[PDB]
Design a protein around this nucleic acid. Structure first.
Length: 54
RNA sequence: UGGUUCUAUUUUGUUGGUUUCUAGGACCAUCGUAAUGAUUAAUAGGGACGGUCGGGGGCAUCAGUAUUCAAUUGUCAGAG
């Protein structure tokens, strides 16, 4: 089937109270008639050293 | 030095019983006699005191940290 044709990406920002806002990306997963995707992977964390932020 | 108390050999006939004579008991106060009378204080002991020492004990608190487990957290093939 493939398990990366469907896989929409994303961008990670960060408080402004920091430097390079810019962290990298993530992978998530689209939907149907009725049902949703964005919420379907939000709440979740990302953890990057102090460093690529200050 | 009393007194006190016991006597009970000895003579005023004597055998026994008051009771006075002399002599032995014994005692608490009593003026007198005395260098008046109490062994060191075991590098044996027990104790007190003083600074102390110690992971000696009990009752309570206190912190480390690993393990296990579970949540949260991520990544993704074998791990043991």
């Amino acid at each position: 089937v493939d398990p990366f044709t469907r896989k929409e990406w994303f961008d990670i920002k960060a408080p402004s109270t920091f430097e390079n806002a810019n962290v990298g990306k993530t992978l998530v997963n689209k939907s149907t008639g009725l049902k949703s995707a964005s919420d379907a992977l939000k709440g979740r964390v990302v953890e990057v050293c102090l460093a690529d932020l200050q």
